[PDB]
Ligand binder design. Structure first.
Ligand SMILES: *C(=O)[C@](NC(=O)Cc1cccs1)(OC)[C@@H]1N=C(C(=O)O)C(=C)CS1
Ligand code: NA
Ligand SMILES: [Zn+2]
Ligand SMILES: [Zn+2]
Ligand SMILES: [Zn+2]
Ligand SMILES: [Zn+2]
Ligand SMILES: [Zn+2]
Ligand SMILES: [Zn+2]
Length: 362
């Protein structure tokens, strides 16, 4: 429909989301959108299947790799505050990495998954800090630095860890005591406090059992965040146009810089972006396993470039029991957050988000 208003918007969102929840047996979903910069909220189903607690915009969901947009923002903030420069070698900020392959990898390459084939996940027995250091010290590059994109927890994890260390504070502390309060995200956590536990959904695994994320090496950096639709939309709004702390503004802007592309997707700090308008087929391809999660040679940029407001920025994320998607278009005043307590197919996330974004654009 080519008309706007509360009536067509609700017809579209309910019409897109309700069938999808049935098709994938999603217990609960929180959805929030921006249109002309104004927010609308839709909640469906249950946070906890046993208790029947209903999802609201306060329900906490694991957002998986969407956490990496906050990790990247924290890393950008530390760069703006002078802790490191993006072209710095990684071992300039980790004395224990001098004389390793990380003498030849930049902080930017580590943040953008282009260090040379760091894997999706740490090997299973890299499960302590000591083992982690040995792991990176001994790592042998699969590809030359800057040439290939391979999405990787170890890569963005180390970026966030070292960025925090450059300011002399642990990552979780910097996130919880500085980044989140300055962003005004008061119900967003890496470690959910006992007072907020009643709002934390359970995830429902592929075997249909309750599950939540567990501690792990660089888990905070790679997949640490639990949040609701209202807080996550607030973070989106800070990305649509932020006025305030100059340092935080600069940091957010730095997450909108493009470093290289794979096909029609441009990799920034945290956020991945597209042209806007963008077709459903392109958005699906950019988020498909072949592109998003396997090794690809990149189209290198001569210099990193501010991608600007006429872009669709996005990120997918998942954990064992949860499936999240966020997309926004700063110039157009439109965005979508979709948080669910099932890890359901990214293709379904993208098709639903595209359809809703097309109505928001009217
Ligand atoms: C981000 O969603 C992703 N996963 C996480 O951050 C959380 C985890 C899920 C399993 C172990 S940690 O970043 C690595 C996705 N994780 C996987 C994966 O299952 O290895 C993907 C293939 C998509 S990226
Ligand atoms: Na850390
Ligand atoms: Zn139209
Ligand atoms: Zn409304
Ligand atoms: Zn072990
Ligand atoms: Zn360290
Ligand atoms: Zn607070
Ligand atoms: Zn921007």
């Amino acid at each position: 429909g080519h008309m706007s208003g509360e009536a067509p918007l609700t017809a579209t969102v309910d019409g897109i989301i309700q069938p999808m929840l049935k098709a994938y047996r999603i217990p609960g979903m929180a959805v929030a959108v921006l249109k002309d910069g104004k927010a609308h909220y839709f909640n469906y189903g249950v946070a906890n299947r046993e208790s029947g607690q209903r999802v609201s915009e306060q329900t906490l969901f694991e957002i998986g790799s969407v956490s990496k947009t906050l990790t990247a923002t924290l890393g950008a903030y530390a760069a703006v505050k002078g802790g490191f420069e993006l072209d710095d070698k990684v071992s300039q900020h980790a004395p224990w990495l001098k004389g390793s392959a990380f003498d030849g990898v930049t902080m930017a390459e580590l943040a953008t998954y282009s260090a040379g084939g760091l894997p999706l996940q740490f090997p299973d027995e890299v499960d302590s800090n000591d083992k982690m250091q040995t792991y990176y010290r001994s790592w042998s590059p699969v590809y030359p630095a800057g040439t290939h994109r391979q999405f990787s927890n170890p890569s963005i994890g180390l970026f966030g860890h070292l960025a925090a260390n450059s300011l002399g504070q642990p990552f979780e502390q910097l996130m919880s005591q500085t980044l989140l309060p300055k962003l005004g995200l008061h119900h967003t956590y890496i470690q959910v406090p006992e007072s907020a536990m009643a709002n934390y959904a359970y995830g429902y695994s592929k075997e249909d059992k309750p599950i939540r994320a567990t501690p792990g090496v660089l888990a905070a950096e790679a997949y640490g965040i639990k949040t609701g639709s209202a807080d996550l939309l607030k973070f989106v709004e800070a990305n649509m146009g932020y006025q305030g702390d100059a340092a935080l503004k600069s940091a957010i802007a730095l997450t909108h810089t493009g470093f290289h592309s794979v096909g029609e997707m441009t990799q920034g700090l945290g956020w991945e972006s597209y042209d806007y308008p963008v077709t459903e087929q392109v958005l699906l391809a950019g988020n498909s396993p072949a592109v998003s999660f396997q090794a690809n040679p990149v189209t290198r940029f001569a210099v990193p470039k501010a991608m600007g407001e006429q872009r669709l920025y996005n990120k997918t994320g998942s954990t064992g029991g949860f499936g999240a998607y966020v997309a926004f278009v700063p110039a157009r005043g439109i965005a979508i957050v979709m948080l669910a307590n099932r890890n359901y197919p990214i293709e379904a996330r993208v098709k639903a988000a595209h359809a809703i974004l097309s109505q928001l654009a009217e």
